[PDB]
DNA sequence: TCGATAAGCAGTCCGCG
DNA sequence: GCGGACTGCTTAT
């Protein structure tokens, strides 16, 4: 087989590295690597290399590591540029890996691992680890088991061993409800006492060392309590033996109000997965508790158990262990779902770089630049210093606020990655600038055309034809991977469709899910077998079509979230290829497609319609329009339809046949107004929306930019079973809104598309009259808190102090003299309720950590004093005036002179 | 929260005769 | 009461 990197690390003059050799074994050497930099060189010296704009430099290979950084710095003292990839362990992969790298996962170490600290005073510090360590679960993916180690003997307490047997029960049964599926892979170790027990942790992590190391909070928790655990029983030779070349360093990590420690362990790639998660996964959770997210993702049920973590160990020793276990589990159940370890080994590979790197789009992308230019004996830039500044970004259409019955959008496909290869923006392919007239002078085609020789932005910058950029080249590999993954990710929607409509009728027989690949559209003669399936059989399939659109979603979206995180590091001073000419030049160039296509798309409709300036675009925002549709469909009369699906189809293919080649038409002209190299502008029809035939339903309603709602009967070709709501900005999408008020406004929202005012009235006076009984926790708002340190004056709300703050101040009060008690973390979430009038609480509102349930000995309290009638009106009522005013409906019925009788 | 801009709403402070 | 200036937070893209 192909050898493939591990991992790497620059020591002194060393690079340390663990592969996988053409074996297929893992290996670990140590190389004195010689570095090579440049230096421009005169034109009477022959060379093969030269920098990205053409001119020749000299290849200068020095003795060792330190003498290359060494003579950056007297470069810097000189004042010359030093050219070349100073990142010496991406050149040493760049020598060492001279192909596309083909990795098997079957041969790289993942361990999933999880501790347990007993601590009777608050929250066990990892920098101080004052407490016995009294339980490690470490999954290791090459052995596929579980190695338990359990901490029998304790200064907080003696107990007896874990037993498998009781675990594996069900609740019901007194038992712990282990899953099934990895009971035979649970290997037990206990332990007399913990120097015996991190001892043979240090023994069996060197015979398992981790290359990928995850967990929950692993970075910022259980990696530094174990190494400063260790360190405090052993001394620090032995903690660093966590490091397979006994490297370790304290990495401060520094945020704008404060900084962190962390421990890096060269040698280690740690991909903390709630890191993973927070990057990957776009969301933003109320609580990234495990049982929290665990919830979210899988649908399991919270790990129950009685009285404090710091109590659990002592009185049910049993549980504290299984549920050390199923949270190990938990991650890898995660993972399976969302895949994002095999993203970071895949984006990882590809760019040449530490697998931790992939949290770094800057890291990511000089890599993949650099191997790129190498290719061709092209010689990387030095990195500079420069200033942050502002920038302008996309354009945005004010809406007029209003309910809209039909609608259907149009989408500019990948379009800062599509500007940057239809204009080639490249920091090499600058040919320079012309004069600039005003933007709307572009967009409504008065302009001076822009040049006859090179290709343009209307922000007034030039770019060569005759060669692709570098940017452009890469850009183009990346988006053509998300494409194919993209793809999958919708046959598997379209998939997900069918099972849903052959769930109608679900037959009476015992069957079997069809084995299938969810990734291609389903063929004929597999529908014909979804129609004769039960409905377990029908659910099972279902279910796996939506994992594989899942795992396509994960793969596409990140990769998306990449080639857009290419034009946005242009934007970032800390980005080798910074450059605000052609960060802008992507920006503006978007504001003048947008404005421009609105242009062309109001005149073709105007045509069709025999009308003379009226407004079919309604709304834009960066690269989307929303047509109001309402003309069309009265073109044809709502009589004539026999039902939704019908009129569905008709807008489909009045946006496929008549409106996108009039869009293409118009971008096609705009391609030969810029003199661009490739005509990339490709706007495809995303959404058709309006309300079911026949009903009183509103269809969709705006309220402001950013701010919409429509229902929604196809979206890029998935034609839905039944209607879907797309919601987008209002509060039914913010993790600050309760998450029964998201629900309550969302069933609004619905009846108002749907099904009408009359519907709408209905329900809300059914929640007003019973909100009072919802569970205060899914009443409560959330926020982040940061710089409670900031507003706190003597344990009270200083000057232009928050309102969540403000509930923190009032809970530290409150729970004052409790160092049992949770204490809210700073720059973590919070549950915020407001207080009635002279509760014992002495302010307005009181505010504690999120996912979590308010201390028992406040609870009652809260509970009792907690301000229903501020909750509501705050959080629903005034939201749903803003959609109900925005729609021109009213939530509650007016008076009418029937009420005479 | 270690790892692009536009723009919305909540809340504080305080003016607005 | 509302709004503007400002901070804080959280979206859409
Ligand atoms: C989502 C997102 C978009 N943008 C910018 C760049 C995008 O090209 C542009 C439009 O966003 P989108 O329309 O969300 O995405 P897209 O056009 O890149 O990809 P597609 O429609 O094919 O899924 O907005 C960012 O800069 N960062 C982001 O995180
Ligand atoms: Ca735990
Ligand atoms: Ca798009
Ligand atoms: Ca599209
Ligand atoms: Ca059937
Ligand atoms: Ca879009």
């Given at each position: ?576 290829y910074y450059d605000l000419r052609n960060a802008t030049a992507i920006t503006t160039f978007g504001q003048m497609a947008l404005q421009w296509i609105e242009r062309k798309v109001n005149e073709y409709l105007n045509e069709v319609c025999g009308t003379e300036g009226e407004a079919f ?24 339809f026999r039902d939704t699906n019908h009129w569905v189809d008709f807008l489909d293919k009045f946006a496929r046949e008549r409106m996108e080649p009039a869009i293409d038409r118009g971008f096609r002209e705009m391609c030969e107004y810029m003199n661009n190299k490739q005509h990339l ?168 950590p999120s996912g979590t349930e308010i201390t028992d000995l406040i609870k009652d309290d809260v509970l009792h004093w907690m301000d229903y009638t501020v909750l509501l009106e705050k959080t629903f009522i005034k939201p749903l005036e803003g959609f109900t005013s925005a729609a021109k ?13």
């Amino acid at each position: 087989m192909k050898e493939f990197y591990l991992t790497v690390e620059q020591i002194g003059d060393s690079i340390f590295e663990r592969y996988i050799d053409s074996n297929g074994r893992e290996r670990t050497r140590e190389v004195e690597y010689k570095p090579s930099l440049f230096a421009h060189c005169p034109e009477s010296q022959a060379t093969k290399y030269f920098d990205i704009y053409g001119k020749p430099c000299t290849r200068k290979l020095f003795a060792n590591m330190r003498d290359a950084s060494q003579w950056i710095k007297r470069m810097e003292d000189i004042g010359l540029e030093a050219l070349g990839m100073d990142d010496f362990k991406l050149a040493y992969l760049s020598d060492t890996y001279n192909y596309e790298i083909k990795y098997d996962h079957t041969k790289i170490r993942v361990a999933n691992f999880d501790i347990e600290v007993t601590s009777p005073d608050g929250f066990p510090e990892p920098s101080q680890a004052k407490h016995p360590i009294d339980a490690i679960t470490h999954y290791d993916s090459i052995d596929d088991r579980f190695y338990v180690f359990d901490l029998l003997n304790s200064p907080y307490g003696n107990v007896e061993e874990w037993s498998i047997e009781i675990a594996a029960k069900l609740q019901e049964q007194g038992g712990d409800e282990v899953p099934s599926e990895i009971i035979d892979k649970i290997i037990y170790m206990p332990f007399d006492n913990e120097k015996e027990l991190l001892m043979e942790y240090l023994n069996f992590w060197q015979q398992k060392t981790p290359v990928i190391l995850t967990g929950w909070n692993v970075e910022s928790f259980a990696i530094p309590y174990v190494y400063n655990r260790i360190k405090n029983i052993f001394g620090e030779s032995t903690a660093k033996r966590l490091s397979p070349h006994r490297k370790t360093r304290v990495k401060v990590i520094e945020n704008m109000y404060g900084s962190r420690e962390i421990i890096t362990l060269f040698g280690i790639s740690v991909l903390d997965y709630i890191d993973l998660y927070k990057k990957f996964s776009f969301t933003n959770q109320p609580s990234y508790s495990l049982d929290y997210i665990s919830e979210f993702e899988l649908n399991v049920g919270k790990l129950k158990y009685d009285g404090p973590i710091s109590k659990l160990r002592e009185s049910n020793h049993q549980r504290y262990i299984s549920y050390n276990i199923i949270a190990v589990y938990r991650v890898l159940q995660i993972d399976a779902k969302r895949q994002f370890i095999n993203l970071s080994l895949d984006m990882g590979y590809y760019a040449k770089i530490q697998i931790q790197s992939v949290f770094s789009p800057i890291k990511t992308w000089d890599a993949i630049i650099f191997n790129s230019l190498k290719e061709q004996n092209k010689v990387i830039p030095q990195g500079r210093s420069h200033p942050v500044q502002p920038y302008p970004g996309a354009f945005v259409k004010e809406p007029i606020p209003n309910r809209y019955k039909y609608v259907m959008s149009f989408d500019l496909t990948s379009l800062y990655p599509s500007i940057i290869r239809q204009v080639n923006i490249s920091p090499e392919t600058i040919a320079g600038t012309f004069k600039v007239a005003p933007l709307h002078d572009y967009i409504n085609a008065v302009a001076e055309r822009p040049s006859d020789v090179y290709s343009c932005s209307p922000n007034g910058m030039m770019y060569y034809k005759d060669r692709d950029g570098v940017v452009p080249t890469e850009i183009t590999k990346v988006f053509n991977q998300r494409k194919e993954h993209k793809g999958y990710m919708l046959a598997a929607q379209r998939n997900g469709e069918i099972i849903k409509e052959a769930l109608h009728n679900p037959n009476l027989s015992v069957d079997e899910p069809l084995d299938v690949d969810y990734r291609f559209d389903f063929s004929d003669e597999i529908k014909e077998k979804i129609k004769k399936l039960s409905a377990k059989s029908l659910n099972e399939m279902l279910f796996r079509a939506q994992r594989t659109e899942v795992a396509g979603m994960t793969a596409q979206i990140n990769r998306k979230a990449l080639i857009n995180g290419l034009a946005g590091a242009l934007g970032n001073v800390w980005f080798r290829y910074y450059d605000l000419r052609n960060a802008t030049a992507i920006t503006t160039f978007g504001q003048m497609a947008l404005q421009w296509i609105e242009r062309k798309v109001n005149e073709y409709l105007n045509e069709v319609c025999g009308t003379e300036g009226e407004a079919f675009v309604l709304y834009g925002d960066t690269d989307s329009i929303y047509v109001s549709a309402d003309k069309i469909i009265d073109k044809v009369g709502e009589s004539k339809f026999r039902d939704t699906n019908h009129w569905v189809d008709f807008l489909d293919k009045f946006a496929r046949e008549r409106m996108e080649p009039a869009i293409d038409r118009g971008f096609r002209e705009m391609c030969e107004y810029m003199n661009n190299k490739q005509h990339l502008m490709f706007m495809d029809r995303e959404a058709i929306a309006g309300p079911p035939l026949g009903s009183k339903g509103i269809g969709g309603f705006w309220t402001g930019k950013k701010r919409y709602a429509l229902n929604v009967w196809d979206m890029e070709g998935t034609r839905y079973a039944e209607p879907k709501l797309k919601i987008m900005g209002l509060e039914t999408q913010k993790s600050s809104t309760p998450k029964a008020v998201q629900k309550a406004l969302k069933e609004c929202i619905r009846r108002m598309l749907q099904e009408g005012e009359e519907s709408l009235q209905e329900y809300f006076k059914e929640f007003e009259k019973e909100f009072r009984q919802l569970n205060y926790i899914s009443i409560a708002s959330v926020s982040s808190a940061n710089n409670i340190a900031k507003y706190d004056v003597g344990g009270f709300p200083g000057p232009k102090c928050p309102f969540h703050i403000r509930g923190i101040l009032t809970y530290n009060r409150a729970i004052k003299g409790n160092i049992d008690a949770p204490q809210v973390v700073e720059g973590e979430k919070v549950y915020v309720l407001p207080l009635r009038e002279g509760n014992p609480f002495g302010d307005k509102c009181i505010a504690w950590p999120s996912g979590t349930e308010i201390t028992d000995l406040i609870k009652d309290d809260v509970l009792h004093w907690m301000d229903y009638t501020v909750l509501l009106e705050k959080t629903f009522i005034k939201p749903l005036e803003g959609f109900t005013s925005a729609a021109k409906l009213d939530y509650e019925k007016k008076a009418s002179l029937f009420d005479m009788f």
